[PDB]
Design an enzyme around this catalytic site. Structure first.
Site, PDB file in Angstrom:
ATOM      1  N   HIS A 198      -7.356  28.166  35.062  1.00  0.00           N
ATOM      2  CA  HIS A 198      -6.187  28.286  35.950  1.00  0.00           C
ATOM      3  C   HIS A 198      -5.322  29.418  35.498  1.00  0.00           C
ATOM      4  CE1 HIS A 198      -2.538  27.093  38.172  1.00  0.00           C
ATOM      5  NE2 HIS A 198      -1.875  26.736  37.093  1.00  0.00           N
TER       6      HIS A 198
ATOM      7  N   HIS B 230      -1.869  30.350  35.497  1.00  0.00           N
ATOM      8  CA  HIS B 230      -0.662  29.494  35.572  1.00  0.00           C
ATOM      9  C   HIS B 230       0.519  30.292  36.073  1.00  0.00           C
ATOM     10  CE1 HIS B 230       2.109  26.318  33.850  1.00  0.00           C
ATOM     11  NE2 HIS B 230       2.869  27.327  34.204  1.00  0.00           N
TER      12      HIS B 230
ATOM     13  N   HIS C  70      -5.338  29.459  31.260  1.00  0.00           N
ATOM     14  CA  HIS C  70      -5.769  28.404  30.365  1.00  0.00           C
ATOM     15  C   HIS C  70      -6.848  27.596  30.992  1.00  0.00           C
ATOM     16  CE1 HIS C  70      -3.349  25.261  32.474  1.00  0.00           C
ATOM     17  NE2 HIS C  70      -2.299  26.064  32.475  1.00  0.00           N
TER      18      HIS C  70
ATOM     19  N   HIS D  44      -8.434  24.396  32.485  1.00  0.00           N
ATOM     20  CA  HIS D  44      -7.824  23.292  33.224  1.00  0.00           C
ATOM     21  C   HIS D  44      -8.857  22.198  33.452  1.00  0.00           C
ATOM     22  CE1 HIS D  44      -4.464  21.490  35.263  1.00  0.00           C
ATOM     23  NE2 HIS D  44      -3.823  22.611  35.506  1.00  0.00           N
TER      24      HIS D  44
ATOM     25  N   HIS E  14       9.358  15.685  28.807  1.00  0.00           N
ATOM     26  CA  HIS E  14       8.168  16.103  29.547  1.00  0.00           C
ATOM     27  C   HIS E  14       8.411  17.348  30.363  1.00  0.00           C
ATOM     28  CE1 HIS E  14       6.327  12.254  28.605  1.00  0.00           C
ATOM     29  NE2 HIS E  14       7.455  11.694  28.959  1.00  0.00           N
TER      30      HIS E  14
ATOM     31  N   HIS F 153       5.281  20.712  35.793  1.00  0.00           N
ATOM     32  CA  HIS F 153       4.870  21.984  36.386  1.00  0.00           C
ATOM     33  C   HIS F 153       4.194  21.719  37.712  1.00  0.00           C
ATOM     34  CE1 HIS F 153       2.837  25.760  37.044  1.00  0.00           C
ATOM     35  NE2 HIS F 153       1.624  25.243  36.832  1.00  0.00           N
TER      36      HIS F 153
ATOM     37  N   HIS G 143       1.744  23.628  40.534  1.00  0.00           N
ATOM     38  CA  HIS G 143       0.922  24.741  40.924  1.00  0.00           C
ATOM     39  C   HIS G 143       1.340  25.230  42.359  1.00  0.00           C
ATOM     40  CE1 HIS G 143      -2.858  23.782  38.314  1.00  0.00           C
ATOM     41  NE2 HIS G 143      -1.799  23.282  37.689  1.00  0.00           N
TER      42      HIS G 143
ATOM     43  N   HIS H 201       2.137  18.108  37.450  1.00  0.00           N
ATOM     44  CA  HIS H 201       1.771  17.353  36.270  1.00  0.00           C
ATOM     45  C   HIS H 201       2.638  17.712  35.088  1.00  0.00           C
ATOM     46  CE1 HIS H 201      -0.324  20.816  34.276  1.00  0.00           C
ATOM     47  NE2 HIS H 201      -0.695  21.208  35.477  1.00  0.00           N
ATOM     48  N   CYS H 202       2.696  16.780  34.131  1.00  0.00           N
ATOM     49  CA  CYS H 202       3.263  17.095  32.850  1.00  0.00           C
ATOM     50  C   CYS H 202       2.355  18.119  32.157  1.00  0.00           C
ATOM     51  CB  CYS H 202       3.376  15.854  31.996  1.00  0.00           C
ATOM     52  SG  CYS H 202       4.180  16.264  30.390  1.00  0.00           S
ATOM     53  N   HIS H 203       2.936  19.098  31.494  1.00  0.00           N
ATOM     54  CA  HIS H 203       2.194  20.163  30.810  1.00  0.00           C
ATOM     55  C   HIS H 203       1.947  19.886  29.340  1.00  0.00           C
ATOM     56  CE1 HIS H 203       0.075  23.905  30.864  1.00  0.00           C
ATOM     57  NE2 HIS H 203       0.468  24.164  32.091  1.00  0.00           N
ATOM     58  N   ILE H 204       2.338  18.709  28.846  1.00  0.00           N
ATOM     59  CA  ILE H 204       1.822  18.216  27.556  1.00  0.00           C
ATOM     60  C   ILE H 204       0.410  17.739  27.889  1.00  0.00           C
ATOM     61  CG2 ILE H 204       2.044  16.505  25.763  1.00  0.00           C
ATOM     62  CD1 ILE H 204       5.168  16.670  26.348  1.00  0.00           C
TER      63      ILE H 204
ATOM     64  N   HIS I  69      -0.790  14.245  27.792  1.00  0.00           N
ATOM     65  CA  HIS I  69      -0.205  13.378  28.824  1.00  0.00           C
ATOM     66  C   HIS I  69      -0.937  13.559  30.142  1.00  0.00           C
ATOM     67  CE1 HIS I  69       3.831  13.318  26.472  1.00  0.00           C
ATOM     68  NE2 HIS I  69       2.830  12.860  25.772  1.00  0.00           N
TER      69      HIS I  69
ATOM     70  N   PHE J 173      -0.776  11.736  33.715  1.00  0.00           N
ATOM     71  CA  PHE J 173       0.602  12.042  34.200  1.00  0.00           C
ATOM     72  C   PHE J 173       0.565  13.180  35.220  1.00  0.00           C
ATOM     73  CE2 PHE J 173       5.202  11.946  32.141  1.00  0.00           C
ATOM     74  CZ  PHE J 173       5.616  11.058  33.094  1.00  0.00           C
TER      75      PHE J 173
HETATM   76 CU   LIG Z   1       4.513  14.519  29.145  1.00  0.00          CU
HETATM   77 CU   LIG Z   2      -0.085  26.087  37.055  1.00  0.00          CU
HETATM   78 CU   LIG Z   3      -0.593  25.144  33.533  1.00  0.00          CU
HETATM   79 CU   LIG Z   4      -1.750  23.039  35.681  1.00  0.00          CU
HETATM   80  F   LIG Z   5       0.560  27.261  38.282  1.00  0.00           F
END
Ligand SMILES: [Cu+2]
Ligand SMILES: [Cu+2]
Ligand SMILES: [Cu+2]
Ligand SMILES: [Cu+2]
Ligand SMILES: [F-]
Ligand SMILES: *[C@@H]1O[C@H](CO)[C@@H](O[C@@H]2O[C@H](CO)[C@@H](O[C@@H]3O[C@H](CO)[C@@H](O)[C@H](O)[C@@H]3O)[C@H](O)[C@H]2NC(C)=O)[C@H](O)[C@H]1NC(C)=O
Ligand SMILES: *[C@@H]1O[C@H](CO)[C@@H](O[C@@H]2O[C@H](CO)[C@@H](O)[C@H](O)[C@H]2NC(C)=O)[C@H](O)[C@H]1NC(C)=O
Length: 497
Positions: free
Chosen positions: A65, A67, A110, A112, A397, A400, A402, A452-455, A458, A463
């Site tokens: 992805h 980001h 990154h 995904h 948290h 993010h 997309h 989604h959470c980006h941790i 998680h 999440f």
């Molecule tokens: Cu989180």
């Molecule tokens: Cu993204």
């Molecule tokens: Cu991302």
């Molecule tokens: Cu993502």
């Molecule tokens: F994104």
């Protein structure tokens, strides 16, 4: 060298030792972090990703992805596994062919798929602006002014034991740093500046988890960009940066020629700087090659506070200036229990058929889309509001979205919304217990967009939801290449699905 906007990118397994401890990794371009992918605003990126992975301990499939890039009309190129594509199998390649109209700033790429980016597949992605409105604020902006912050683990992502707490073993700044335990004096990164010049430092969190308190002894930092969005100049002496966020800041090389510590304190893992953990070196040309002797203050004078940021352009806020003043006002119930996260009671488990493919095959409402209860339709050409009240364990948290950036109508730790001039960004901390971080955007990008959470730990634990934006126009808006159509049959055959 930067690569792109047309480039191959090989994904391989190799050993690395960025903190002195050797482990196998998943790498783009042979390095951690991966090479910078770059171009100019509006360019056509054609990134042919060669999956050469052979070690199943970090997964031999992959998907990448880009980001923060919106992918309008190219949802199929977005990368989240089982949302927009099936993964690429080993020994095959896939051309992510997309354009970046209307965007310029600091991004990253990154894996995904699962927690695979934690195993190493992460790198910067910069879209320069030949007519950047901030150009006159600095002299130097190139590969040497990108600063990545990364968490690094000795245990492989797939091998993190069920029911044990996950924390990192080192903070890596530009790929180097020292381990929190059994610390050895492995090399630290050096960022070099020339006395009198001004630098656009592009600060990129490629974290799987921690947020960092980033500072540079003796210096301050003038923020000019937030997650791809140009900002008014904001001078700070510390930046709390959450997973996946980016800032550009002007660094004025206006201190005496010398060595200064660069600090990145994670919110978990090793605390402090003993033995040079959590550290890198700012070195002026002509300085002695030696470690800094500088110290941090006890208390920073001008920490970044998100409500202090404002767009450079007149971006406003869509909708009406009160809670719920949107065409589609949502409030999500974000929870954690028993090892799983949930959104409105549903924990995300990736479906067998990617959401986009389900839509192209004729599923035409979100109740029909799998996973059940994980896909929420959004109407076209509408103002969306999403309140994200905090409280779920493991915070703060960083959420993010997309396909979009968004107005941050309400930020962490401050109950007052801003319907006038808040920053726009793509990843936002939802804060602490009782906060009500709230985002707004308009729906002008048909397709399924992951929220989604980006941790990453998680996300893996559920999440997330998918916003199926404008289901009716998704197929017409996002024509798909044959290579994309071929992904799921190849993946399902290889996996005996
Ligand atoms: Cu989180
Ligand atoms: Cu993204
Ligand atoms: Cu991302
Ligand atoms: Cu993502
Ligand atoms: F994104
Ligand atoms: C908590 O968040 C709120 C909302 O983002 C922050 O409130 C905003 O604070 C700014 C800075 O004081 C106010 O703008 C100022 O407006 C005056 C006109 O009264 C102008 O003279 C100043 O130069 C400046 O632009 C802004 O109106 C205000 N917005 C709202 C909706 O209240 C607040 O500062 C945050 N709290 C903390 C402790 O940071
Ligand atoms: C966060 O803000 C949202 C609105 O953006 C609040 O939502 C309201 O919630 C109450 C029940 O708590 C409902 O009766 C309303 O219909 C909701 N929408 C409104 C008023 O616009 C939400 O309560 C806030 N959450 C927290 C934790 O402060």
């Amino acid at each position: 060298a930067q690569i792109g906007p047309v480039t191959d990118l090989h994904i391989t397994n190799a050993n690395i030792s960025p903190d002195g401890f050797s482990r196998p990794a998943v790498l783009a371009g042979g390095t951690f972090p991966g090479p910078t992918i770059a171009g100019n605003t509006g360019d056509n990126f054609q990134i042919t990703v060669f999956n050469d992975l052979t070690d199943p301990s970090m997964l031999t499939d992959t998907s990448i992805h880009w980001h923060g890039l919106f992918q309008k009309g190219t949802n199929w190129a977005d990368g989240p596994a089982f949302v927009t594509q099936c993964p690429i199998i080993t020994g095959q390649s896939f051309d992510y062919n997309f354009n970046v109209p209307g965007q310029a700033g600091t991004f990253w790429y990154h894996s995904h798929l699962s927690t695979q980016y934690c195993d190493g597949l992460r790198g910067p992605f910069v879209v320069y602006d030949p007519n950047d409105p901030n150009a006159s604020l600095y002299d130097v902006d190139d590969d040497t002014t990108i600063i990545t912050l990364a968490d690094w683990y000795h245990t492989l992502a797939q091998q993190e034991p069920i029911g044990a707490a996950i924390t990192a073993d080192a903070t890596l700044i530009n790929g180097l740093g020292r381990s929190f335990t059994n610390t050895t004096a492995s090399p630290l990164s050096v960022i070099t500046v020339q006395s009198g010049k001004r630098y656009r430092m592009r600060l990129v969190s490629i974290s799987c988890d921690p947020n960092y308190l980033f500072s540079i002894d003796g210096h301050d930092m003038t923020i000019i960009e937030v997650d791809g969005v140009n900002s008014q100049q904001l001078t700070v002496d510390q930046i709390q940066i959450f997973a996946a966020q980016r800032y550009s800041f002007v660094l004025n090389a206006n201190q005496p020629v010398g060595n200064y510590w660069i600090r990145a304190q994670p919110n978990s893992g090793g605390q402090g700087f003993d033995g040079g953990i959590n550290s890198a070196i700012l070195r002026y040309e002509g300085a002695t090659v030696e470690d800094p002797t500088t110290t941090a203050p006890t208390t920073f004078s001008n920490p970044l506070v998100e409500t202090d940021l404002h767009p450079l352009a007149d971006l406003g806020v869509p909708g009406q200036p009160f809670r719920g003043g949107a065409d589609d006002p949502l409030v999500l119930n974000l929870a954690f229990a028993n090892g799983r996260f949930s959104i409105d009671g549903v924990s995300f488990v990736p479906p067998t058929v990617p959401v986009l493919l389900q839509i192209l095959s004729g599923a035409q409402n979100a109740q029909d889309l799998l996973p059940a209860g994980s896909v929420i339709s959004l109407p076209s050409n509408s103002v969306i509001e999403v309140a994200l009240p905090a409280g779920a364990a493991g915070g703060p948290h960083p959420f993010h979205l997309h396909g979009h950036n968004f107005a941050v109508v309400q930020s962490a730790n401050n109950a007052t919304p801003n319907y006038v001039n808040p920053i726009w960004r793509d990843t936002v901390s939802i804060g602490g217990t009782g906060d009500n971080v709230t985002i707004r955007f308009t729906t002008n990008n048909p397709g399924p967009w992951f929220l989604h959470c980006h941790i990453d730990w998680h996300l893996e634990a559920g999440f997330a939801i998918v916003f199926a934006e404008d289901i009716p126009d998704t197929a017409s808006a996002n024509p798909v290449p044959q290579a994309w159509s071929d992904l799921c049959p190849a993946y399902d055959q290889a996996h005996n699905i």
